[PDB]
């Protein structure tokens, strides 16, 4: 009955993923560290999954480190960077943008509050909702250690120019090296891109990349890509313990979850283009129907000029004092969506800081609703929720 | 055809746990923070599991914080303590910790790290080489004006020896009244109860601790964990290691792993419902096991889990058979049925190095080098014991026979 359009918040598990998790729970329950066959069996599942993730993003198995999820992966990159700077050695400097996920913004703000590091939160262009390359390069100081920019924004869907950033940073690094300055590394939070658009680390040129399983129909765990970890790129751990994950992330491996993530990654490798095309077809049809139904009263908050965006995201607002996002969704009987990051669902009456950062007017941001379609969404489901929205609007704003 | 006796390394999942996880994956996949029924349904599964864990250890739901496993839980309490120390002062200087010499890597290493980085000072109290237990008097004797945390494992994973946590907590509570009188900050107590859950009753009111680590895969649950914090936000502070979405009341952000939490809650219910049965059964099997080992090997056997005057886990039997050729890993390499280990899995890459824990417990190097750790479980039978004992006899004879 309901129509789910909140895939950016989380995705359901593919049946093959569920199957993998289940078989691992039953068949490969042994401690992966144990010498006997049962332990070696779990280890192989883990090795296979590491290769799956590596293949998904075009990196190598040795560049993948499993973590409990996106939040851990993001905090890890930031924590490692601070340690690296102190080992190389005044505080480390970070460069990021104003629309990152809480797992990037907050750990950085925390470092600032504690006076451990200095951070330049580069405002995104209020024109295209994208961080601009020149603003990032201009922010680099002798103490700059890491540039962390999300590949795609979870609320707007806007793609950031990661590949250009890495390229410009590489160029600037050649000068720093000759000058005796350490290199500025680059990390990208790719949580919302995986499974929606091709993600290749060689194309992106990044040194770190965050992988989030529950964004691409996988389990609630994740990983962190680190270009030639320990050799080409340094990684200092947050956790200390039994030596798992080459001591970069100790703790008995969660084989079942890893198995699920691996299978999830395989499906992306094999079908990413199919998913992307279907999402784009559905999202475009969705925007077409919303425009036909609401005309001049609707504003498409995800259609910025000159920039790319996820194929599945359509953040929009309908003009009207009575059409606050959370009020509209409350009146919907079929549509399941959100007004922004799930992480902020306890204050839905407040305009999204992210949309405001993107130049979206306050009253437009207050009425914003984020629709994010998925692999299974159909045109018939789009029609259903457009009609659901029509009734919700007519009830709140009334006829115009 | 194999007989598993390495439950202290990890345990298989109970059928019900597996079902709980599978059900959650299929029916409760929504984001717990979402403003619609799908999200509300996952949150309820999480709340139920929180209550389940609380009941298992005699605490309250509000005092349970889910984590990714034992390692995270242990690192978290140590991190939080460092933060707390400085915060209280702010309201150059280093916090002091007290632990013992036989803690798991997830307690020992984070503490060594702080010492190396000059972030804190730590007193690694040596356990008794007589009873392999850390003594209450030695811990209290190590207390300094700057001591803020005493962390002692409830049960050792290699020997099975039970540490006097309730008495440690009692003596610290009395000391804190004296410290408060002079205006000094209080000393908190944490216990790594990884190896005790599901094997013996664990009651936070009995133990008197402020923090307690819970490890799912040690009691037939999923590979995640939790941290008990006594009246968190009211009687005990907890400073987060991770920052982000506000989940777990911001003590541990990150979209909740509902299926794993579902499994953990179910594993906890089983312990709550059947702990006495599990314990009594393990004790019977383990005691029968030692009887048979002594019967078959006689005076050649050394029982390394039989220290005088102390309690021990009901399922553990660490032992050694004398002989230059009977190194633990060598013996196990010859076994065709028995599945065990020579120490914490975490150190399997160097099974040829005598256990530092056994050595710290007074076990002579000749005995320590030949140690094998047998840890039985809920399903282990006396028949299976007889099998591995014959498997050991066979193995021993091969090792000592013509080259
Ligand atoms: C989902 C997401 C994350 C990770 O969040 P978790 O709660 O740990 O799953 C990080 N960044 C972005 C942009 C995301 O959408
Ligand atoms: C298993 C165990 C832990 C936790 O270890 P993980 O590898 O994170 O599951 C902590 N302490 C002790 C004594 C343990 O046996």
Residues B263 and B117 in one domain: no
A196/chain B closest Cα distance in angstroms: 19
Structural domain harbouring B315: 1-13+298-403
Hey, are the CB atoms on B254 and A69 less than 8 Å from each other?
Answer: yes
- All residues of chain A having their beta carbon less than 8 Å from the beta carbon of residue B259 are 21, 219-220
The residues lining ligand 2, judged by C-beta closer than 6 Å to any ligand atom, are: A 242, 251-252; B 69-71, 74, 104, 106, 153, 157, 192, 194-195, 215, 217-218
- Nearest Cα to A298, choosing from A306, A310, A290? A290
Candidates A26, A103, A326; nearest CB to B244: A103
On whether the CB atoms of residues B80 and B88 are closer than 8 A, the answer is no
> Is B335 an active-site residue?
no
On whether the CB atoms of residues B332 and B372 are closer than 8 A, the answer is yes
Hey, are the CB atoms on B253 and A35 less than 8 Å from each other?
Answer: no
- C-alpha R_g of chain A: 22
Which CATH number goes with the domain that contains A393?
3.90.1150.10
- Elucidated via: X-ray
Report residue B75 as tokens.
Answer: 């690192």
On whether the CB atoms of residues B192 and B103 are closer than 8 A, the answer is yes
Sign of CA dihedral A378, A360, B30, A110: positive
C-alpha span between B79 and B251 (Å, rounded): 12
C-alpha span between A87 and A81 (Å, rounded): 10
The Cβ of residue B383 has, within 10 Å, a number of other Cβ atoms equal to 8
* C-alpha torsion A299→A302→A304→A308, nearest 10: -160
- All residues of chain A having their beta carbon less than 8 Å from the beta carbon of residue B113 are 240
On whether the CB atoms of residues A127 and A305 are closer than 8 A, the answer is yes
Residues A299 and A376 in one domain: yes
Residues B354 and B226 in one domain: no
At which residue do the structure tokens 């058979």 appear?
B321
C-alpha span between B304 and B361 (Å, rounded): 9
> Minimal Cα distance from A28: which residue of B?
B12
Hey, are the CB atoms on B68 and A219 less than 8 Å from each other?
Answer: no
Distances (CA, A) of B137 to B83, B133, B308: 28, 12, 18
On whether the CB atoms of residues B157 and B372 are closer than 8 A, the answer is no
On whether the CB atoms of residues A1 and A333 are closer than 8 A, the answer is no
Supply the residue whose CA is at minimum distance from atom 2 of ligand 1.
Answer: A191
The residues pairing with A146 across neighbouring beta strands, listed in sequence order, are A94, A185
Resolution, rounded to a tenth of an Å? 1.9
- Nearest Cα to A198, choosing from A241, A167, A159, A255? A159
* C-alpha torsion A236→A239→A244→A246, nearest 10: 10
Domain total in chain A? 3
B45/chain A closest Cα distance in angstroms: 15
A70 Cα to the center of ligand 1, angstroms:
5
> Minimal Cα distance from A254: which residue of B?
B223
> CB-based contacts of B170: which residues, under 8 Å, 6+ apart?
B208
Candidates A22, A33, A68; nearest CB to B346: A33
The Cβ of residue A14 has, within 10 Å, a number of other Cβ atoms equal to 18
DSSP state for residue B210 in the 8-state scheme:
S
Residues A146 and A226 in one domain: yes
Looking at A84, A314, A332, A343, which residue is catalytic? A343
Please count the CA atoms within 13 angstroms of the CA of A332 that sit on its side-chain side: 28
Pocket-testing residue among B100, B157, B315, ligand 2, by greatest number of atoms within 8 A of Cβ: B157
Write b or e for each residue in A102-111: b if 16 or more Cβ atoms lie within 10 A of its Cβ, otherwise e: bbbbbbbebb
> CB-based contacts of A97: which residues, under 8 Å, 6+ apart?
A121, A122, A123, A124, A131, A136, A149, A150, A160
Counting from 1 in the atom list of ligand 2, the atom nearest the Cα of B72 is 8
Residues B128 and B144 in one domain: yes
Domain boundary among A237, A261, A294: A294
Domain boundary among A274, A294, A314: A294
* C-alpha torsion B3→B7→B13→B17, nearest 10: 140
C-alpha span between A156 and B293 (Å, rounded): 68
**Exposed (0-12), middle (13-18) or buried (19+): which is B16, by Cβ within 10 Å?**
middle
Hey, are the CB atoms on A33 and B6 less than 8 Å from each other?
Answer: no
On whether the CB atoms of residues B17 and B267 are closer than 8 A, the answer is yes
C-alpha span between A254 and A213 (Å, rounded): 14
On whether the CB atoms of residues B254 and A103 are closer than 8 A, the answer is yes
At which residue do the structure tokens 């995705």 appear?
A11
Distances (CA, A) of B118 to B77, B82, B92: 18, 12, 10
H helices within B69-199, ranges in order? 70-90, 105-116, 136-141, 165-181
C-alpha span between A262 and A163 (Å, rounded): 26
DSSP 3-state of B399 = helix
Residues B269 and B381 in one domain: no
A343/chain B closest Cα distance in angstroms: 5
C-alpha span between B199 and A142 (Å, rounded): 56
- All residues of chain A having their beta carbon less than 8 Å from the beta carbon of residue B74 are 241
Sign of CA dihedral B315, B276, B162, A32: positive
C-alpha span between A104 and A341 (Å, rounded): 14
DSSP state for residue B326 in the 8-state scheme:
-
The residue of B37, B66, B68, B78 whose CB has the most chain A CBs within 10 angstroms, and thus the best one to mutate to test that interface, is: B68
On whether the CB atoms of residues B41 and B30 are closer than 8 A, the answer is yes
- Nearest Cα to A63, choosing from A272, A177, A204? A204
The Cβ of residue A399 has, within 10 Å, a number of other Cβ atoms equal to 5
**Exposed (0-12), middle (13-18) or buried (19+): which is B194, by Cβ within 10 Å?**
buried
Residues B48 and B191 in one domain: no
On whether the CB atoms of residues A82 and A107 are closer than 8 A, the answer is no
Hey, are the CB atoms on B34 and A9 less than 8 Å from each other?
Answer: yes
Phi, psi of B176 (to 5 degrees): -60, -30
Report residue B144 as tokens.
Answer: 């300094």
Residues B65 and B54 in one domain: no
Residues B100 and B222 in one domain: yes
Write b or e for each residue in B173-183: b if 16 or more Cβ atoms lie within 10 A of its Cβ, otherwise e: eebbeebeeee
Counting one residue from A and one from B, how many pairs have CB atoms under 8 Å apart? Answer: 201
Phi, psi of B150 (to 5 degrees): -115, 115
- Nearest Cα to B212, choosing from B193, B240, B239? B193
* Angle, helix A15-27 to helix A255-294, in steps of 10 degrees: 170
The Cβ of residue A36 has, within 10 Å, a number of other Cβ atoms equal to 21
A369/chain B closest Cα distance in angstroms: 13
Which CATH number goes with the domain that contains A20?
1.10.260.50
Task: Determine how β-strand B64-67 pairs with β-strand A64-67.
Answer: unpaired
Report residue B255 as tokens.
Answer: 């979209």
Domain boundary among B240, B273, B297: B297
A145 Cα to the center of ligand 1, angstroms:
23
Hey, are the CB atoms on A242 and B72 less than 8 Å from each other?
Answer: no
Residues B284 and B330 in one domain: no
C-alpha span between A302 and A315 (Å, rounded): 5
C-alpha span between B320 and B365 (Å, rounded): 11
Residues A337 and A400 in one domain: yes
DSSP 3-state of B356 = helix
* Angle, helix A37-57 to helix A15-27, in steps of 10 degrees: 160
Residues A99 and A210 in one domain: yes
3-state SS of chain A? Answer: CCEECECCCCCCCCHHHHHHHHHHHHHCCCCCCCCCHHHHHHHHHHHHHHHHHHHHHCCCHHHEEEECCHHHHHHHHHHHHHHHHHHHCCCCEEEEECCCCHHHHHHHHHHHHCCCCEEEEECCCCCCCCCCHHHHHHHCCCCEEEEECCCECCCCCEECCHHHHHHHHHHHHHHHHHCCCCCCEEEEECCCCCCCCCCCHHHHCCCEEEEEHHHCCCCCCEEEEECCECCCECCCCCCCCCCCHHHCCCCCCCHHHHHHHHHHHHHHHHHHHHHHHHHHHHHHHHHHHHHHHHHHHEEECCCCCCCCECCCEEEEEECCCCCCHHHHHHHCCCEECECCCHHHHHHCCCCCHHHHHCCCCHHHHHCCEEEECCCCCCHHHHHHHHHHHHHHHHHHCCCC
- All residues of chain A having their beta carbon less than 8 Å from the beta carbon of residue B20 are none
A306/chain B closest Cα distance in angstroms: 31
On whether the CB atoms of residues A67 and A74 are closer than 8 A, the answer is no
Candidates B33, B113, B257; nearest CB to A220: B257
A128 Cα to the center of ligand 1, angstroms:
23
B194 Cα to the center of ligand 2, angstroms:
6
Sign of CA dihedral A245, A250, A256, A261: negative
Looking at B100, B275, B335, B346, which residue is catalytic? B346
At which residue do the structure tokens 């010498």 appear?
A35
Hey, are the CB atoms on B31 and A12 less than 8 Å from each other?
Answer: no
Which CATH number goes with the domain that contains A228?
3.40.640.10
Hey, are the CB atoms on B68 and A241 less than 8 Å from each other?
Answer: no
Supply the residue whose CA is at minimum distance from atom 4 of ligand 2.
Answer: B70
Strands (DSSP E) contained in B161-315 are: 188-192, 211-215, 225-229, 301-303
């Amino acid at each position: 009955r309901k129509v789910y359009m909140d895939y950016n918040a989380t995705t359901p598990l593919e049946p093959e993923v569920i199957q993998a998790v289940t078989e691992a729970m039953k068949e490969a329950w042994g401690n992966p560290s144990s010498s006997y066959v049962a332990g070696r069996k779990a280890k192989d599942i883990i090795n296979t999954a590491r290769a799956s993730l590596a293949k998904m993003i075009g990196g190598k198995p040795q560049d993948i480190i499993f973590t409990s999820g996106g939040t851990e992966s993001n905090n890890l990159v930031i924590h490692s960077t601070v340690r690296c700077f102190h080992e190389q050695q005044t505080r480390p400097h970070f460069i990021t943008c104003t629309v990152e996920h809480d797992s990037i913004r907050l750990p950085l703000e925390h470092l600032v509050e504690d006076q451990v590091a200095e951070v330049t939160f580069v405002p995104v262009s209020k024109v295209n909702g994208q961080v601009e390359v020149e603003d990032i390069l201009a922010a680099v100081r002798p103490t700059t250690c890491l540039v962390t920019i999300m590949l795609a924004n979870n609320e707007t869907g806007v793609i950031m120019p990661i590949s250009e950033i890495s390229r410009r940073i590489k160029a600037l690094n050649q000068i720093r090296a000759a000058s005796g300055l350490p290199r500025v590394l680059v990390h990208t939070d790719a949580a919302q891109a995986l499974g929606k658009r091709r993600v290749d680390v060689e194309d992106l040129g990044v040194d770190f990349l965050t992988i989030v399983g529950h964004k691409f129909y996988g389990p609630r765990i994740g990983a962190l890509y680190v270009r030639g970890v320990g050799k080409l790129t340094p990684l200092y751990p947050m956790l200390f313990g039994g030596g798992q994950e080459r001591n970069f992330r100790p703790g008995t491996e969660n084989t079942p979850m890893i198995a699920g993530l691996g299978k999830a990654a395989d499906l992306v490798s094999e079908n990413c283009e199919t998913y992307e095309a279907h999402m784009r077809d559905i999202r475009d049809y969705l925007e077409e129907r919303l425009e036909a139904e609401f005309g001049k009263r609707i504003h498409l908050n995800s259609r910025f000029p000159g920039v790319e965006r996820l194929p599945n995201t359509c953040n929009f607002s309908i003009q009207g004092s009575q059409l606050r996002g959370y009020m509209v969704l409350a009146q919907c009987q079929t549509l399941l969506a959100s007004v922004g990051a799930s992480c902020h669902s306890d204050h839905e009456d407040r305009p999204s800081p992210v949309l405001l950062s993107c130049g979206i007017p306050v009253d437009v941001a207050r009425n914003a609703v984020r629709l994010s379609v998925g692999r299974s969404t159909t045109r018939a489901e789009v029609d259903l929720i457009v009609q659901d929205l029509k009734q919700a609007v007519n009830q709140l704003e009334g006829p115009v």
